[PDB]
Structure formats: C-alpha cells, structure tokens
UniProtKB/Swiss-Prot annotation:
Family the entry assigns: Belongs to the metallo-dependent hydrolases superfamily. Adenosine and AMP deaminases family.
NCBIfam families documented for this protein: aden_deam
Residues reported in the UniProt entry to bind Zn(2+): 12, 14, 211, 292
UniProt-reported outcome of changing residue 293 to N: Reduces affinity for adenosine 10-fold. Reduces enzyme activity 100-fold
Protein name: Adenosine deaminase
Activity vs pH: Optimum pH is 6-8.5.
CDD domains: ADA
Outcome (variant: residue 214 to S): Loss of activity
Keyword Heme applies: no
Length: 349
C-alpha cells in the first residue's frame, strides 16, 4: 500500500549506492574479489545499516562492494541498466542518477581507487558505460533518465576532469556536476580544484548541484550557493539554522534535494528535533523527496514517502506539489522539461 502511488521525479540518488546485492554477489564470485559475506542476506546486513552512524561512518560501507564493481565494464553497464529498471518499478517517470566516474575506473586515475590493479577502464570509459546502460534501460522500461557526475570533496585533483566529462557528455545523459563525499572535511568546499571546476561550470553553462548542510553548518550551504553557484543544494537541512540564510534561499526559490530516511541513518538529522523538511513543507519551499543510497539504507522511494506521510504529515497534495517542483527544478533542457511537467499534470488529473 504505497504512500504515493503516482508518477514521481527523483533528483538525488547515487548509482553506486543503489546496486542489487545479487549483482554485487555475482561480480565478487565472477571476478574472484572478496565480499564481507556470500549471501545477499548477510551481504545486506554488512553493507546495510539500520542505525544512525555518521557521514564518515556511512561512507565506508562502499569499501565492501565497490571493489567488485570498479574496473569491470560488464558490471558498470549492468548496474546502470538495473537502476532504470528499479526506478521504473518505483513509479519514477524521470530520474537523475549521480556517481563518481573516478571511483569506478581502474585506469588513468590517481590515487587508484580500491587498490586496484591498473586496467583499461578510464574515467571517460565509465561515463560512456553508464550512458549505455542508462539508455538501454530507458528504452526498455520506458522512463526518462539523466546522470550527474560527482566531484569528491577529498579529491579536488579530479574535479576539473569531471567538468570536462560533463561538457563532453552534455545531455548525452550527463546533465550536471555534483560535489559529494565527506562534508566534514574542513574547507573541502573551498579547495581550488572544486572552486575552479564550478567556476567553469558557470562559464560553460554546465548545471550545478552540491551536497551541503547534510551534516555541515550554514556556512557550508552559503559557500555552495555563493561561491560554487549551485542551482540546487543536496540535503540542505542545516540551512534553517541560519534564519537569514534560509529566508534568502527561500526567496531565491533554491531547490533542496531532501532524502528523509538517509538523513536519519547518517545523523544528518537528530531524531529528537523536527525534520527540516517539515519546515520546508510549511514554508512551501522548493524541494524534492529522494532516496540517496537505497542499497546501504535498505530502502525504496516509498520508504521516504511513508516516512514523511506517517511521521511528518504529508498529504497527496504536498506529494504532487513537491514533484511538480522537482520537475521544474530538473536539469532537463526546456522542451523536455515541459514534456515532463505535461505528463505529471496529465497523470495528476
Ligand atoms: O556516488 C558518488 C559518491 O558520493 C558519495 N555519497 C553517496 N551518498 C552520499 C551522501 O548523500 N552524502 C554525501 N556523499 C554521498 C559516496 O562516496 C559515493 O561513492
Ligand atoms: Zn547524496
């Protein structure tokens, strides 16, 4: 019994965070790379989390499985393909999947991710592979899907190349650039590589999103918006701690990519306080409801919908509104953007 059984738009989900345990298991065995378990069930208890941790503590779960996926072309394309399929089943009509192309390469990257052995899967090759998987999926489960390439807070030396990958693959699935990773890393928002990568996104008209205010302070959000020029804030819950900042983002109609379940499990949100999306709903803010890393959170898009419904008083009207705003806030070009809005209004009749 779904909380909102109608078309949805998802703007914040990590491809490397939305993989099938069965596919992880499949590639570990197939490539002979070890996993912390040999059963999807136990594999799910290891990778998965059911209790709040920290952002740094949540980010480590990727260590368990990324090594069986990274560097494998067959695996990179497959997870992309299975991703559309999963979203299609969730009643998502449009989705932007994000991921770091560097963390899945085994060539032309430095530091080599996961102590991998050099190979031929270059970062560009990864983008190409995901596009192919994503394309085959759209054209098979019939949902529209775009991708977003992530700069990693810890590795700014990779940022300018991410930008280049966005330029080269512009709308050839890639619609934007993100800044993901450990938001606790003091000053990561200000590292030259990142800063310079965004400055170029602005001059070359490459869309921009940035995780900020998930666990960091208002100043992290302020810098994402003012220095990095984000068009959207991933999470952004901590903005409400700076009344002035919030009101001004509210005025600019800043879009907040909200992930309810994820915020509890990463400690982004203290469960003894009211969720910031409650205030967002009440101030009629521009915001989407997203899944983030469903593999690790052992969830689905309905988990976040059921949570807001059951615990935060969300009605179908708010569900409709947030998704129309998500559509408007997407990085789809005008024509397609309108086509999306048209479908929502049609189906929302
Ligand atoms: O998907 C690209 C990377 O972004 C990082 N992620 C995933 N989830 C996530 C969270 O919302 N907050 C910050 N960074 C995150 C992970 O390290 C993942 O490998
Ligand atoms: Zn995220």
């Amino acid at each position: 019994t779904p909380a909102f059984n109608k078309p949805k738009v998802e703007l914040h989900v990590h491809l490397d965070g939305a993989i099938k345990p069965e596919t992880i298991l499949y590639f570990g065995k197939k490539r002979g790379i070890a996993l912390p378990a040999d059963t999807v069930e136990e594999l799910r208890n290891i990778i998965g989390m059911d209790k709040p941790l920290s952002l740094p503590g949540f980010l480590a779960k990727f260590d368990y499985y990324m090594p069986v996926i990274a560097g494998c072309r067959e695996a990179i394309k497959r997870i992309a393909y299975e991703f559309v399929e999963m979203k299609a089943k969730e009643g998502v009509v449009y989705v932007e999947v994000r991921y770091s192309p560097h963390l899945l390469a085994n060539s032309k990257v430095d530091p080599m991710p996961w102590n991998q052995t050099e190979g031929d899967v270059t970062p560009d090759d990864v983008v190409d592979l995901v596009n192919q998987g994503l394309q085959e999926g759209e054209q098979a489960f019939g949902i529209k899907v775009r991708s977003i390439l992530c700069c990693m807070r810890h590795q700014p030396s990779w940022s300018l190349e991410v930008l280049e990958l966005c330029k080269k693959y512009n709308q050839k699935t890639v619609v934007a650039m993100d800044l993901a990773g450990d938001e606790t890393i003091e000053g990561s928002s200000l590292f030259p590589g990142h800063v310079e990568a965004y400055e170029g996104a602005v001059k070359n008209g490459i869309h921009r999103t940035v995780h900020a205010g998930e666990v960091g302070s208002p100043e992290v959000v302020r810098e994402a918006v003012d220095i990095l020029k984000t068009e959207r804030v991933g999470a952004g819950y901590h903005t409400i701690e700076d009344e002035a900042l919030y009101n001004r983002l509210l005025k600019e109609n800043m879009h907040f990519e909200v992930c309810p379940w994820s915020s509890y499990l990463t400690g982004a949100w203290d469960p003894k306080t009211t969720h910031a999306v409650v205030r967002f709903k009440n101030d009629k803010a521009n915001y989407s409801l997203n899944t983030d890393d469903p593999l690790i959170f052992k969830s689905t898009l309905d988990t976040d919908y059921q949570m807001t419904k059951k615990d935060m008083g969300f009605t179908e009207e708010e569900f409709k509104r947030l998704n129309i705003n998500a559509a408007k806030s997407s990085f789809l070009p005008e024509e397609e953007k309108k086509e999306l809005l048209e479908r929502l209004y049609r189906e929302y009749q």
